Amino acid sequence: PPVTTVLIRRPDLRYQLGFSVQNGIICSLMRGGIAERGGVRVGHRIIEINGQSVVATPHEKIVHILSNAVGEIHMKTMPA
């Protein structure tokens, strides 16, 4: 079970995480964002984000949470 837990740190709302989401898979990653610390691995398959299984959720929706996810984002990701 190579499941990684992305614990991102968001102090504000204008602080990008450092990656893009596509329904359930990641696209790119910026070596500097807080997403690196959390767990976000460009190439995995996010799913249970703070309790919401994005596995079958649109991309815009996932970006929304993270777009308005102040504090600390906690999600799970599998190997895609």
DSSP string, 19-63: EEEETTEEEEE-TTSTHHHHT--TTEEE-EETTEEGGGS-HHHHH
65 vs 17, 70, 74, CA distance in Å? 11, 9, 11
User: Which secondary-structure segment (H or E) carries 58?
Assistant: none
Instruction: Report CA dihedral (79, 27, 20, 23) to the nearest 10 degrees.
Output: -60
The span from the CA of 28 to the CA of 42, in Å, is: 6
Which residues, at least 6 apart from 31, have a Cβ–Cβ distance to it below 8 Å? none
39 alpha carbon, distance to own chain's centre: 8
Name which of 44, 40, 50, 49 is nearest 78 in CA terms: 44
Domain that holds residue 70: 1-80
Residue 58 tokens read as 């649109």
Number of structural domains found in the chain: 1
Please list the residues that pair with 29 across neighbouring strands: 19
CATH number of the domain that residue 74 is part of: 2.30.42.10
